[PDB]
Design a binder for this molecule. Structure first.
Ligand code: COH
Ligand code: COH
Ligand SMILES: *[C@@H]1O[C@H](CO)[C@@H](O[C@@H]2O[C@H](CO)[C@@H](O[C@H]3O[C@H](CO)[C@@H](O)[C@H](O)[C@@H]3O)[C@H](O)[C@H]2NC(C)=O)[C@H](O)[C@H]1NC(C)=O
Ligand SMILES: *[C@@H]1O[C@@H](CO)[C@@H](O[C@@H]2O[C@H](CO)[C@@H](O)[C@H](O)[C@H]2NC(C)=O)[C@H](O)[C@H]1NC(C)=O
Ligand SMILES: *[C@@H]1O[C@H](CO)[C@@H](O[C@@H]2O[C@H](CO)[C@@H](O)[C@H](O)[C@H]2NC(C)=O)[C@H](O)[C@H]1NC(C)=O
Ligand SMILES: *[C@@H]1O[C@H](CO)[C@@H](O[C@H]2O[C@H](CO)[C@@H](O)[C@H](O)[C@H]2NC(C)=O)[C@H](O)[C@H]1NC(C)=O
Ligand SMILES: CCCCCCCCO[C@@H]1O[C@H](CO)[C@@H](O)[C@H](O)[C@H]1O
Ligand SMILES: CCCCCCCCCCCCCCCC(=O)O
Ligand SMILES: *[C@@H]1O[C@H](CO)[C@@H](O)[C@H](O)[C@H]1NC(C)=O
Ligand SMILES: *[C@@H]1O[C@H](CO)[C@@H](O)[C@H](O)[C@H]1NC(C)=O
Lengths: 551, 552
């Protein structure tokens, strides 16, 4: 079998076979040396001594409210802290990217072929004696067994951070521009070749699709007016392919950038809001620039909406998720005197960690109605009959599920949860502890340490035998959450680097793009820099219902 | 017309219209302010007072050989100088890239669509009253007239830097991996979607083509053995499409990564050499790694050859071109403590400036023969008859033509040279002086200042009326050269930024790739470490003939 199967190289050292039954580690720039890169250099010893734990840092950021109140009002100090948040996270990500499902060694194919998700860790070699390498049993536990014992929801567990349905649908809508798995090729492949925040879920992935969606007047996107309200156009009008089962009426077959958004009225709600927003920005640019043509109004509006998206994601969405008293800031200038790569490649493991199926409630509560999953799916009538104002008011009030802490995946989506496990194995993911070490975390030394409790730990012990062959995805869902938090440590420590990298590593954040002229002048630039989840809803939804990501 | 037509914003400030007849300049991070970004900040004044001209710096780098002897042998100083060369030149290139032929303002389409060449300056607006904006006549001079009066060769002018045919064919072979204009779509479009040194000219642009070229044993490329010599395989064997006239014998239809390389035996010489090098590197890695499969052998050899290529281009090719006494260095570590983007997008103007057709001789002199263009074209039998060893020996000794200084484009190639001008205008290139300013050179104030002589200057004055509407491509070829040099100032100050950016931007130069394990261990890494034009020929050409990029 492959000599690297045991994952011998530590501290980001690279393993390479040297003959049939021997390996060598490449310890270059790890700060360690020795056979398995485990002997620290002197400066490294000091760094290890002078480095606070993630849980310590989390404590500091979620206490001392009065101190952070001061910090948040000293522009210089807010800037300094945000600068450190961004730099320390982003260095954990390989950029330019390296491995993929087919390449456990660096190759031009892995670098150049955009159809692949990239990989934060190389796949387990095909000939390893056990699924994870050398440890554990010859077979991993039945995925159905893992799912039923520790993942599936008994009673609904609400998120203690107060995340709502506006938050849950924003997460799904936003992430589905860059998680777009190419099922015809396999779970290791994507159809989001832009690999980031390009808003293809509004504008279409291909030029062909964009052009069928565009009005070609005033920069705008095609739309319908129904009972005085602006909605997306139809599949019949535009000839834009959408996924609708055969029974949905033609009138209610809305066509948007992302072909799956008809699946859920909560996604169609955000699709409608963002369509209205593009067209609103076109109206504003048109009065700033009566001389501009349709193409420049369209392109400049797209750049503004990209900027709004990143702004909202950092200062509302990630702000809410974090639980910090520190006020995060979207400010590209923070990186202009730093080393940083303005590029991104979407990791398979980032897609996997974002399978937040426990967020979903048992029913979708709008106005006086409670819709089951069966009723809610593909049901654009629900959206037309209640309207966007009531959707916003109802979803702002409805609480979402807790993601970590176990037993909170709704049964309605049991097959999707099982697929996450099965597809992880098909893609030959390394174990939870390999991933923790890869992101500078101490491995868990027992199942009780992972879960913070005795019962699930005992089931997992019976299923996996060894903590070192525990799988990443189910671990994220059973992990001990932070105090009164939606997530545990592993989720935050892997998710944050991927997240901030893909947000700041957009070309609009680069020095050549981050200028008022890129966005049509000072008015366009101000739209980006003052954007919020509340203003997006206020500007585009009748009556300006109040909103946020909590309650 | 468009209010920015006159190019009012200076010092890399951005122009945008504000109303039908008004503009505003964006001076963000230019170091200047005021209506047209022409008032310097205080620190900018100091920099502008202190900064030596390119011609002063060229003088220093080509003189004081005694001091450079010292500097070259103190690794710390050599590293310090090379680091400055890399970073100052790279700063002039927008990365992530910005404009293209269709977009004179930043857009997601221009950023994301890899089928376009990028643009260092936006195109002149469609509605400008004048070809270059607002200056000059309503029409530019007839392109045939520019070509015949100032570009066509009267007699062969040899390169005074001593560039040879080994150099000329290396330039053509190397650059044709990334200048692959998609003539189906138009001159502002490329088929080289990798936008840099990926070696698609050896391996193929697409997976399908690569797989048809591969042996699938030992990591190797397919080959044939003719008279005991290794050559590329045929079109018939591989089913790889190549450009060849119908009458070429089956066995002479050589299939290689780049479809145009059968056009010229000098290109096929290098294709054959690099194919042999790939297979040689496969043998080395198989000896180091008897446990490796064919895929990893192939992929690792390809990364090694990319490293070899960059190494030779910097330390032999660019070194030769430069004429510097300072010894250039390929060393990715130089940038590890610097700000730098490991990515590249090929600029249309970089393609244009690299139309070095005056390099070509009047005839191709191999052994005792002198071949015309007509005889040489598509003629692989010449390669077989003389052999690679004799090709190397002959091309090492044949002088190439001077590029700058005017009147040195061979007549055989007149249609290509004319197309360079016509396509520049089709793509609405800004004037020479705009490009000079964009790259912080002082604009030329007369045609005599441009050429350094009287006669061509007078022809150009009559053709163009105004030095401010003189075009970039013909200017590059008539420019006064540096003393005893192949190129003038404009070639170097534009070309060096695009070149170094595209050499260092490659992912193999990034800290996560630049490690022995990327290249199969120390042995693969060492292959890059010692690579040179001499070792390339020595390892892959029977008899290990001497070679270099200069005649003597
Ligand atoms: C972000 C949180 C989130 C939410 C709220 C959510 C809400 C819902 C929802 C009700 C609204 C339903 C019916 C589903 C059901 C599905 N989920 Co999500 N999912 C979420 C995270 C994801 C992600 C991320 C993917 C990956 C999509 C991809 O790769 O194509 C996913 C994949 C899927 C797929 C496609 C299979 C696959 O490609 O893996 C289905 C079907 N699921 N999910
Ligand atoms: C590096 C210097 C150099 C040399 C020595 C050289 C020598 C020769 C040569 C040898 C006898 C022949 C037959 C030609 C013939 C041509 N060259 Co060059 N060319 C050179 C630089 C270029 C470049 C760069 C292009 C643009 C290629 C592109 O855009 O595809 C080019 C374009 C062409 C074209 C137009 C088609 C195309 O590829 O775009 C023809 C025809 N030519 N040239
Ligand atoms: C990158 O930019 C290219 C230039 O815009 C673009 O090529 C263009 O693609 C469009 C859309 O497919 C073609 O327009 C089509 O429109 C109708 C069909 O609705 C047909 O009648 C047309 O003939 C044509 O198919 C353009 O013809 C085409 N322009 C070209 C080839 O110069 C690329 O699509 C862009 N690349 C990507 C990945 O988006
Ligand atoms: C920066 O921009 C240029 C505009 O190109 C210059 O405008 C010139 O102003 C003169 C006013 O007397 C005109 O005679 C001249 O026609 C005009 N140039 C053109 C081509 O329109 C501005 O004055 C200059 N501004 C500053 C502050 O230097
Ligand atoms: C990126 O990689 C994929 C997977 O190897 C390539 O898809 C294959 O393409 C080949 C050659 O055309 C086909 O024979 C296979 O059917 C494809 N395999 C699949 C879809 O899994 C794809 O071509 C690559 N992309 C590029 C631009 O090279
Ligand atoms: C290098 O790391 C490797 C891999 O973990 C170590 O390999 C061995 O260590 C064990 C303890 O001495 C041996 O009994 C085993 O044969 C082997 N490990 C396994 C289970 O594969 C090695 O000790 C490390 N070397 C150094 C210098 O620490
Ligand atoms: C060598 C290719 C033929 C060019 C001839 C047509 C254009 C004539 O051009 C003329 O050529 C003369 C001789 O070089 C010069 O003295 C003139 O300055 C030039 O205008
Ligand atoms: C990537 C191809 C390299 C070819 C270079 C094209 C135009 C000449 C550039 C090199 C000029 C010589 C000096 C180089 C070092 C420097 O001054 O930055
Ligand atoms: C979808 O939801 C509507 C609410 O508008 C509900 O009345 C209906 O039963 C559902 N659609 C059908 C007929 O399946
Ligand atoms: C090609 O070169 C050969 C020498 O190898 C020469 O004899 C022949 O005439 C050339 N072919 C043509 C068509 O000119």
């Amino acid at each position: 079998h492959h000599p690297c199967c045991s994952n011998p190289c530590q501290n980001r050292g690279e393993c390479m076979s040297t003959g049939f039954d021997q390996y060598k580690c490449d310890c270059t720039r790890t700060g360690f040396y020795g056979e398995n890169c485990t002997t620290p250099e002197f400066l490294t010893r000091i760094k290890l001594l002078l480095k606070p734990t993630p849980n310590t840092v989390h404590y500091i950021l979620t206490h001392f409210k009065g101190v952070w109140n001061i910090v948040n009002n000293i522009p210089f100090l807010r800037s300094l802290i945000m600068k450190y948040v961004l730099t320390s996270r982003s260095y954990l990500i390989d950029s330019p990217p390296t491995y993929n499902v087919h390449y456990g060694y660096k190759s031009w194919e892995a670098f150049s072929n955009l159809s692949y998700y990239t990989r934060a860790l190389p796949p387990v070699a095909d000939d390893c004696p056990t699924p994870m390498g050398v440890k554990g049993n010859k077979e991993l536990p039945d995925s159905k067994e893992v799912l039923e014992k520790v993942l599936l929801r008994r009673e609904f567990i609400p998120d203690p951070q107060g995340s709502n349905m506006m938050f849950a649908f924003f997460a799904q809508h936003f992430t589905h521009q860059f998680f777009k798995t190419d099922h015809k090729r396999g779970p290791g492949f994507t159809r989001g070749l832009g690999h980031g925040v390009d808003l293809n879920h509004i504008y279409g992935e291909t030029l062909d699709r964009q052009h069928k969606l565009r009005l070609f007047k005033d920069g705008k996107l095609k739309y319908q007016v129904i009972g005085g309200e602006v909605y997306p156009p139809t599949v019949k009008d535009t000839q834009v392919e959408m996924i609708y089962p055969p029974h949905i009426p033609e009138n209610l077959q809305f066509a948007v950038g992302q072909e799956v958004f008809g699946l859920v009225p909560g996604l169609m709600m955000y699709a409608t809001i963002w369509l209205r927003e593009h067209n609103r920005v076109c109206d504003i640019l048109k009065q700033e620039h009566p001389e501009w043509g349709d193409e420049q109004l369209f392109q400049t509006s797209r750049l503004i909406l990209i900027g709004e998206t990143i702004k909202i994601v950092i200062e509302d969405y990630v702000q809410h998720l974090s639980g910090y008293h520190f006020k995060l800031k979207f400010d590209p200038e923070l990186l202009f005197n730093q080393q940083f790569q303005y590029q991104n490649r979407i990791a398979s493991e980032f897609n996997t960690l974002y399978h937040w199926h426990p967020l979903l409630p048992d029913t979708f509560n709008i106005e006086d109605q409670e819709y089951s999953f069966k009723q809610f799916l593909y049901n654009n009538s629900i959206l037309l009959e209640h309207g966007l104002t009531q959707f916003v008011e109802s979803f702002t009030r409805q609480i979402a599920g807790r993601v970590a802490g176990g037993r909170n995946v709704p049964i309605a989506v049991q097959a999707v949860a099982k697929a996450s496990i099965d597809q992880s194995r098909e893609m030959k993911y390394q174990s939870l502890n390999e991933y923790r070490k890869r992101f500078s975390l101490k491995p868990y030394t027992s199942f009780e340490e992972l879960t913070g409790e005795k019962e699930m730990a005992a089931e997992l012990k019976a299923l996996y035998s060894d903590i070192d062959v525990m799988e990443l995805y189910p671990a994220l869902l059973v992990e001990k959450p932070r105090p009164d938090a939606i997530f545990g440590e592993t989720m935050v420590e892997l998710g944050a680097p991927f997240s901030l990298k893909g947000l700041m590593g957009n070309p609009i954040c680069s020095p050549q793009y981050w200028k008022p002229s890129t966005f049509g002048g000072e008015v366009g630039f101000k739209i980006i820099n003052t954007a919020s989840i509340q203003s997006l809803i206020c500007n585009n939804v009748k009556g300006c219902p109040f909103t946020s990501f909590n309650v």
